[PDB]
Design an enzyme around this catalytic site. Structure first.
Site, PDB file in Angstrom:
ATOM      1  N   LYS A 108      54.079  22.341  13.646  1.00  0.00           N
ATOM      2  CA  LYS A 108      53.544  22.945  12.726  1.00  0.00           C
ATOM      3  C   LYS A 108      53.744  23.207  11.086  1.00  0.00           C
ATOM      4  O   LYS A 108      52.572  22.942   9.668  1.00  0.00           O
ATOM      5  CB  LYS A 108      53.086  24.508  13.014  1.00  0.00           C
ATOM      6  CG  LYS A 108      52.265  24.626  14.191  1.00  0.00           C
ATOM      7  CD  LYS A 108      51.484  23.689  14.365  1.00  0.00           C
ATOM      8  CE  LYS A 108      50.581  24.089  16.225  1.00  0.00           C
ATOM      9  NZ  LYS A 108      49.297  23.410  16.213  1.00  0.00           N
ATOM     10  N   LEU A 167      42.460  27.894  18.551  1.00  0.00           N
ATOM     11  CA  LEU A 167      42.779  27.159  19.243  1.00  0.00           C
ATOM     12  C   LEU A 167      42.738  25.788  18.255  1.00  0.00           C
ATOM     13  O   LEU A 167      41.966  24.833  18.220  1.00  0.00           O
ATOM     14  CB  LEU A 167      43.638  27.216  20.236  1.00  0.00           C
ATOM     15  CG  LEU A 167      43.737  28.362  21.794  1.00  0.00           C
ATOM     16  CD1 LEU A 167      43.847  28.091  22.520  1.00  0.00           C
ATOM     17  CD2 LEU A 167      45.034  28.942  20.822  1.00  0.00           C
ATOM     18  N   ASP A 168      44.115  24.926  17.548  1.00  0.00           N
ATOM     19  CA  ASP A 168      44.009  23.452  17.392  1.00  0.00           C
ATOM     20  C   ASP A 168      44.203  23.356  18.917  1.00  0.00           C
ATOM     21  O   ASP A 168      44.437  22.970  19.909  1.00  0.00           O
ATOM     22  CB  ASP A 168      44.787  23.681  16.629  1.00  0.00           C
ATOM     23  CG  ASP A 168      46.221  24.468  16.210  1.00  0.00           C
ATOM     24  OD1 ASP A 168      46.395  24.945  17.953  1.00  0.00           O
ATOM     25  OD2 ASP A 168      46.876  24.280  15.414  1.00  0.00           O
ATOM     26  N   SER A 169      44.798  21.867  18.714  1.00  0.00           N
ATOM     27  CA  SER A 169      44.691  20.839  19.966  1.00  0.00           C
ATOM     28  C   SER A 169      46.607  20.957  20.353  1.00  0.00           C
ATOM     29  O   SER A 169      46.212  21.136  21.656  1.00  0.00           O
ATOM     30  CB  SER A 169      44.712  19.435  19.255  1.00  0.00           C
ATOM     31  OG  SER A 169      46.263  19.012  18.569  1.00  0.00           O
TER      32      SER A 169
END
Ligand SMILES: CCCCCCCCCCCCCCCCCCCC(=O)O[C@H](COC(=O)CCCCCCCCCCCCCC)COP(=O)(O)OCCN
Ligand SMILES: CCCCCCCCCCCC(=O)SCCNC(=O)CCNC(=O)[C@H](O)C(C)(C)COP(=O)(O)O
Ligand code: SF4
Ligand code: SF4
Lengths: 119, 216, 383, 84, 199, 45, 135, 90
Positions: free
Chosen positions: A46, D39-41
């Site tokens: 991230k 939620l992302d991947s």
């Protein structure tokens, strides 16, 4: 649909597949779990979520690959994982809302005249 | 595979007159005229082979490095069979800060040549592993030292630095002493990397004269 | 059947090797290097040109002055400096003494790795004699720092050529008694014949140089094709073999010792009187009596020992027939008193890259023979 | 149909519960990973890895990429002939 | 001799090649097949009954009865020259005044940065050092400091036997270097009376 | 007439900086530090 | 050169010399002749027709081949061609075959396809001894 | 067969600190003792780089290049190997 071919999630899936062999080989069975390790490696990803260039993404994935085989081939031992991967994460999530009301500035003031360099 | 032992007598000569004249004078113009799209710039300078001559330097794009090197290896007048090294030079003032440099030697006609490609940090250079077999370790070292990515390499991995070493040491913005240092810890019973501390810091002596004319 | 490769780790104790075997036969060899990488190419950017010269003694520390030679020649070409005649003769003479030292060590360390212990102990006393020759002219047995830009550092002391002639008068006898133990011996032949064969096309494709290249039938010597200093005046032969064998490389190296002895004898008889340093005072420091008596010499002494000379902007690559092959320096000049970039090309780096294709089809007891016959030193490999 | 549609559902909820970025009461038996749960991947990959850890399977990249919902995960586990 | 044989070949591809084809007979470095009885007996007395091992054994037995090249250190020493670069030392004039004048040239030329110098003016107006350190564990023993010195103050003397038990004993300050010079002054002067003809 | 340091290798350095395709290389902000591989707190200075 | 073998080798016989230096084992076991050189050079002359007529690459290759064939024509013995072209004939046949192999890759890349106002800057070096030493 | 290990005074008869004849080392040329001008021998700062006119519409004639090459064994001319590098008289 997923930016730059979804290569970040493909590399994340590859590392997550590689992870239990790392835990067995480095004997980290009673130190960290696979769930928290997956969360930590996710938190490594991230930090570069705002990269706007695909070539930087490809270089970052290549470098992360070379890091994962230098962990696979026992070229960095368990103390390297301790001092570089999981304790920085636990320090960034352990100092949040401390038991003292001192600001970060005042802790820095009482530590030394200058900011800390490195870890 | 050339320069087989043929004369059984002692030879008191280097090359022939016509081929040495062609190599030392006409090779730049020849390469420019035969393959003009491969060449973007040329320098004829102080001659890698000897102090007495002049030899060319060819600038090319990364898109045509492999065909130009194949031409320079296989053409009948330029038989550059030996690749001596691959390296890089950092120029932080430029838009493309790296110059990848290839030196070649022709055993057939006692010649040498230099080939340059200019790229930045995120533009890949095609590998020359299929053209020259020594290009493997030199491209690995160039990636290790400068961070130049060579596309199509079989196994591009670091070869010289430490196992966990991130960072490319031969860049101009990388410090001479680095960021980390190494010691043994009695408590952890392991050799441990720590942030750098020096008992005596490095003293930089700035000697350069304000009358000196040669600084470029 | 579906036989997987058995792998092996070969020595932390500075070469690391990861082999693969299909029984007793090797299928792959991968050298892992960098255990002696001290970053000398980065450190040379922070030195002046005189300051960075003793780095080169510590690259191939079996052959020191030959490593100095190429760096000095690269600086001299960009500076447009001429070397006087006596300095050129001294440089050729000590380059050949250096080659004799390197070949003594290489052949005897190879024969000790194979198992013969006596030739090592016989050749190292001759190595001690040539170390005394280094020490009498530079004060250091190994890292001489003798070759300088424009010539050599000091003159030859009175009485050196007399003793070099006295050593050269008996060196052929030493090489003869060395070959009585190895050349016509069946165990040495059975260890060395047809082991690690290199053809000419593979030699040029893999960037080979030096005695490897001559044992595959290639007539290529840089002292005869692209001569430097007074090597064009020297009369000597190029030894040629044609199998590409360990045995043929051993024979070529012995003959190269004979030819180096021939060049040494020629230099002992044609040594001229005159200057040993270039008279350009803006590059070469003055004499110590001149510095203590004239103002211009003291100014030039002060400035050459602090800022140093400024090399004009440009680039060059200069190579020397080092005793392990072609040793070259790529010097990049921006105009300052410090090198902008100094790439070092080492022959052992290219020779060690071949171990994957040379050890295929060989056994475990032939890996050490291949490593010994490539003549590798990891100071120049790992810069 | 290789396994029941209740115990697999509560096991899915049980492993969805221990996620720090998820809400322990917003989780429904029929939701979405993107619009609903946010939620992302990589979070989806982490949840699918947790489901794989609980049910003892191996879900490839394309199959885990097709899974976008709690109901999709339950249906994929139920349709799998090698479930535990 | 350097001759080859079919069978003495160290590898397998050439061993397979020599026993299935006669290509080795074209090569001039091979030993030819014996043609009559006496040549067969010579070849068999080469292969059996050794006689190539015996020549090396005779040479090593001759070396067993020969002279030896060992010196009995420390009762006997090696051979060195007046140019030899050993332990660094600081020198004086015959009056007893220091030669060093704090020019900082030896500190500038030192490629290892093994020299640290501080100075101010002495109470009689003279220009003298207050600190002159040499890190002997950083030194490379090049002699460049000896070349850069214009007053012959710093030298590398003829001492090579100065190994210690602690590393703090090898961080020399100014007082110890002057003590070294006061110890080795006559030998240094004898060496410099010859080496001043060349330098 | 044009003569601005026209007798040295700096002519061959000013061009080779304006070679086409390589004279227009550009990266986004902070991107070269991500690929440099040095610690990220260095760029807080 | 010096032969490291202690036996006496003639080396006036050219086949013995080609055997000793490893040409037979490592490069070509079949002996190269004048006719094979002519055939290989005519193969190059046929292969170069894929390049355009006005290209300097075609002119360069054709002129090299024409000179090589003229040397082959005016010299009957192969030792004479060895002494003129400064190689072994096996090397020369390999050179011609490599030159013929090069043509489709260059033709696919098309280096002659530059614009009409194509420009290449060249920087040349002049030594100091031109203006300092005697003319 | 020459013997290793020569006996007394047959090798290094005099130590280098007891040279039997005093040495007189030249450090300057006699041509430069009283003629000291430097700009006539400033080889370092007198080299030039010149930008050639743009190599576009030149005429490479291959006919002239191959017309100067020999076709017979005799009439082949070879460049002799240089005996020494330039010393400029010193
Ligand atoms: C004190 C220590 C003494 C030993 C010192 C020397 C050690 C040498 C070790 C290596 C020896 C090599 C060796 O034995 O080689 C063999 C030949 O010699 C032998 O076989 C030698 C042993 C047999 C001696 C001769 C036997 C026959 C004599 C005549 C018998 C018939 C007439 C009388 C009845 C085979 O090597 P190769 O090359 O021949 O192998 C044929 C296939 N490559
Ligand atoms: C043993 C431990 C060793 C671990 C070493 C391996 C560490 C490797 C880490 C370095 C690899 C990278 O960061 S790779 C660089 C990742 N960043 C990019 O690619 C730029 C585009 N942003 C994204 O992709 C984001 O993930 C996102 C916006 C969430 C896309 O949303 P989705 O996700 O929904 O698709
Ligand atoms: S001898 Fe070399 S390393 Fe020692 S102090 Fe002098 S310059 Fe420094
Ligand atoms: S020892 Fe010599 S060079 Fe060093 S500071 Fe003193 S006077 Fe100067």
């Amino acid at each position: 649909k997923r930016l730059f071919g979804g290569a970040a999630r493909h590399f994340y899936f590859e590392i997550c597949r590689c992870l239990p062999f790392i835990q067995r080989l480095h004997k980290m069975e009673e130190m960290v779990s696979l769930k928290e390790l997956r969360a930590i490696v996710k938190e490594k990803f991230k930090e570069y979520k705002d990269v706007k260039d695909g070539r930087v993404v490809d270089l970052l994935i290549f470098k992360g690959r070379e890091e994962i085989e230098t962990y696979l081939l026992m070229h960095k031992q368990r103390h390297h994982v301790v001092t570089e991967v999981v304790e920085p994460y636990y320090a960034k999530q352990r100092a949040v809302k401390k038991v003292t009301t001192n600001s970060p500035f005042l802790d820095s003031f009482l530590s030394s005249g200058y900011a800390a360099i490195g870890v | 595979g050339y320069a087989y032992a043929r004369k059984t007598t002692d030879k008191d000569y280097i090359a022939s007159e016509h081929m040495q004249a062609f190599g030392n004078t006409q090779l730049t113009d020849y390469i420019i005229k035969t393959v003009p799209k491969f060449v973007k710039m040329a320098v004829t300078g102080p001659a890698q082979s000897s102090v007495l001559y002049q030899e060319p330097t060819i600038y090319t794009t990364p898109e045509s490095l492999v065909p130009l090197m194949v031409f320079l290896r296989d053409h009948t007048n330029t038989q550059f069979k030996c690749l001596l090294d691959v390296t890089a030079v950092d120029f932080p003032e430029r838009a493309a800060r790296f110059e990848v440099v290839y030196h070649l030697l022709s055993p057939r006609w006692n010649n040498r040549i230099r080939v340059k490609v200019c790229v930045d940090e995120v533009t890949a250079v095609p590998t020359l592993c299929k053209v020259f077999n020594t290009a493997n370790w030199f491209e690995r070292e160039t990636w290790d030292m400068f961070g130049v990515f060579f596309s199509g390499h079989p196994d591009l991995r670091r070869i010289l630095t430490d196992y966990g070493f991130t960072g490319h040491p031969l860049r101009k913005d990388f410090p001479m002493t680095g960021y980390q240092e190494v010691r043994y810890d009695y408590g952890k019973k392991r050799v441990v990397s720590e942030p750098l501390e020096l008992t005596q810091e490095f003293r930089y002596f700035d000697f350069n004269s304000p009358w000196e004319t040669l600084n470029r | 059947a579906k036989v997987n490769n058995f792998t092996l780790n070969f020595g932390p104790q500075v070469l690391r090797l990861v082999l693969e075997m299909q029984g007793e036969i090797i299928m792959r060899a991968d050298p892992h290097i960098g255990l002696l990488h001290r970053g000398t190419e980065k450190l040379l950017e922070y030195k002046t040109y005189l300051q960075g010269l003793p780095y080169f003694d510590r690259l191939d520390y079996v052959s020191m002055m030959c490593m100095e030679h190429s760096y000095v020649l690269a600086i001299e070409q960009l500076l447009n400096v001429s070397v006087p005649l006596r300095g050129q003769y001294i440089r050729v003479l000590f380059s050949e003494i250096t080659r004799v030292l390197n070949h003594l060590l290489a052949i005897t360390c190879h024969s000790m790795d194979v198992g013969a212990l006596t030739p090592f102990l016989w050749a190292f006393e001759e190595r001690e004699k040539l170390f005394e020759f280094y020490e009498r002219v530079s004060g250091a047995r190994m890292h001489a720092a003798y070759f300088r830009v424009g010539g050599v550092s000091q003159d030859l002391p009175i009485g050196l050529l007399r003793d070099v002639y006295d050593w050269a008068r008996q060196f052929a006898s030493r090489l003869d008694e060395m070959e009585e133990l190895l050349t016509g011996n069946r165990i040495w032949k059975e260890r060395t014949v047809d082991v690690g064969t290199i053809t000419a096309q593979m030699a040029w494709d893999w960037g080979c140089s030096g005695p490897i290249l001559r044992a595959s039938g290639i007539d290529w010597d840089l002292r005869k094709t692209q001569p430097y200093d007074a090597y064009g005046k020297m009369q000597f032969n190029v030894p040629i073999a044609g199998h590409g064998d360990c045995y043929d490389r051993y024979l070529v190296r012995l003959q190269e010792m004979r030819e180096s002895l021939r060049i040494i004898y020629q230099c002992l008889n044609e040594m001229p009187d005159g200057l040993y340093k270039s008279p350009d005072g803006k590059v070469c420091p003055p004499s110590r009596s001149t510095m203590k008596q004239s103002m211009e010499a003291l100014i030039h002494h002060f400035k050459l020992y602090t800022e140093g000379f400024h090399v004009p902007a440009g680039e060059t690559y200069r190579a020397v027939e080092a005793p392990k092959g072609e040793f070259g320096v790529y010097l990049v000049s921006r105009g300052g008193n410090r090198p902008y970039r100094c790439k070092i090309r080492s022959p052992g780096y290219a020779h060690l890259q071949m171990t994957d294709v040379i050890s295929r089809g060989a056994m475990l007891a032939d890996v050490v023979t291949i490593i010994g016959t490539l003549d590798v030193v990891f100071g120049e490999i790992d810069r | 149909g290789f396994l029941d549609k209740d115990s697999v559902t509560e096991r899915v909820l049980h492993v969805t519960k221990h996620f720090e970025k998820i809400d322990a009461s917003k989780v429904s038996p029929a939701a979405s990973f993107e619009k609903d749960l946010g939620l992302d991947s990589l979070d989806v990959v982490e949840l699918v890895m947790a489901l794989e850890e609980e049910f003892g399977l191996e879900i490839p990249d394309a199959e885990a990429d097709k899974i976008a919902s709690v109901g999709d995960a339950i249906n994929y586990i139920c349709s799998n002939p090698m479930a535990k | 001799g350097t001759e080859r044989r079919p069978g003495e070949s160290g590898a397998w591809k050439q061993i397979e090649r020599q026993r299935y084809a006669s290509d080795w007979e074209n090569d001039p470095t091979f030993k030819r097949t014996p043609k009559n009885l006496a040549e067969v007996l010579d070849d068999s007395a080469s292969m059996l009954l050794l006689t190539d091992v015996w020549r090396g054994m005779a040479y090593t037995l001759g070396a067993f009865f020969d002279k030896k090249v060992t010196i009995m250190y420390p009762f006997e020493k090696g051979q060195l020259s007046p140019r030899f670069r050993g332990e660094h030392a600081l020198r004086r004039y015959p009056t007893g005044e220091e030669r060093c004048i704090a020019c900082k040239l030896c500190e500038a030329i030192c490629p290892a940065q093994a020299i640290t110098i501080e100075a101010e003016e002495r109470e009689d107006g003279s220009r003298r050092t207050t600190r002159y350190d040499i890190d002997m564990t950083k030194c490379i023993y090049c002699g460049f400091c000896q070349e850069a010195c214009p007053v012959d103050a710093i030298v590398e003397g003829p001492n090579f036997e100065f190994s210690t038990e602690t590393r703090e004993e090898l961080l020399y300050d100014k007082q110890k270097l002057l003590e070294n010079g006061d110890k080795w002054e006559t030998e240094i002067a004898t060496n410099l009376r010859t080496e001043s003809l060349y330098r | 007439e044009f003569a601005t340091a026209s007798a040295d290798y700096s002519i061959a350095m000013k061009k080779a900086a304006e070679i086409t395709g390589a004279a227009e290389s550009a990266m986004g902000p902070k991107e070269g530090g991500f690929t440099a591989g040095v610690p990220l707190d260095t760029f807080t200075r | 050169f010096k032969a490291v073998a202690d036996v006496e080798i003639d080396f006036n016989n050219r086949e013995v010399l080609k055997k000793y230096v490893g040409i037979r084992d490592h490069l070509s076991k079949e002996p190269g002749t004048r006719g094979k050189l002519i055939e290989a050079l005519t193969e190059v002359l046929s292969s170069i027709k894929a390049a355009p007529e006005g290209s300097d690459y075609r002119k360069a290759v054709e002129a090299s081949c024409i000179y090589r064939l003229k040397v082959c024509k005016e010299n009957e013995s192969d030792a004479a061609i060895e002494e003129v072209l400064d190689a072994h004939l096996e090397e020369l046949i390999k050179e011609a075959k490599e030159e013929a192999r090069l043509v489709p890759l260059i033709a696919g890349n098309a280096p002659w396809d530059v614009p009409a106002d194509y420009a290449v800057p060249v920087v040349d070096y002049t030594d100091a001894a031109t203006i300092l030493d005697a003319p | 067969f020459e013997h290793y290990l020569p006996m007394g005074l047959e090798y290094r008869k005099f130590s280098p600190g007891t040279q039997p004849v005093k040495a007189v080392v030249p450090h300057d040329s006699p041509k430069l003792v009283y003629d000291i001008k430097y700009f006539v021998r400033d080889y370092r700062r007198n080299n030039k780089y010149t930008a050639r006119t743009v190599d576009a519409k030149t005429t490479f004639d291959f006919d002239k290049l191959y017309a100067g090459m020999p076709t017979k064994p005799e009439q082949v001319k070879n460049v002799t190997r240089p005996l020494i590098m330039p010393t400029r008289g010193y």
